[PDB]
Design a protein around this ligand. Sequence first.
Ligand SMILES: COCC(=O)Nc1cccc(NC(C)=O)c1
Length: 171
Amino acid sequence: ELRVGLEESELWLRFKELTNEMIVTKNGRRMFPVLKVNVSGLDPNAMYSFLLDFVAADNHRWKYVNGEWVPGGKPEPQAPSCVYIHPDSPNFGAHWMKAPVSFSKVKLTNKLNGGGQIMLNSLHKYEPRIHIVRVGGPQRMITSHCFPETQFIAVTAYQNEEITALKIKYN
Ligand SMILES: COCC(=O)Nc1cccc(NC(C)=O)c1
């Protein structure tokens, strides 16, 4: 059985219990913590690409009001995010299973951008999601996995200083 697990869930849960925030910039900002995924049960000899996207967890705009995140009252449908191709793709199962798959080079932006960078809407709440695509083979296959522990609100600057402090303490 294909098993997908979160590396350093310990640390992600500290961020999550405070409400996690990720900076987005016009040029694109890398994530901290970095999404690292433990993968077992692939065919060592089969070929796979790892894809990352961000699901809008709800349809609302969020605001930091008197030290607390609170949703707007006017939902709008959230067009799905673009997909980030893990730069080590495509690769043998063996490659993906020999160390945690680390999305250290994805950059989060607030502006439609040349390439690489993934555009998010600021003050929306996002749930990271990967797709493992079996490629080259006759029988194309996709397995998807969500990481609730890694939810965050996209922000142009940090609102909750407890987050600012965790980010610095653990970077
Ligand atoms: C929007 O389409 C999503 C996508 O990028 N698919 C996709 C699937 C499998 C492999 C690759 N490309 C590499 C470089 O491995 C791309």
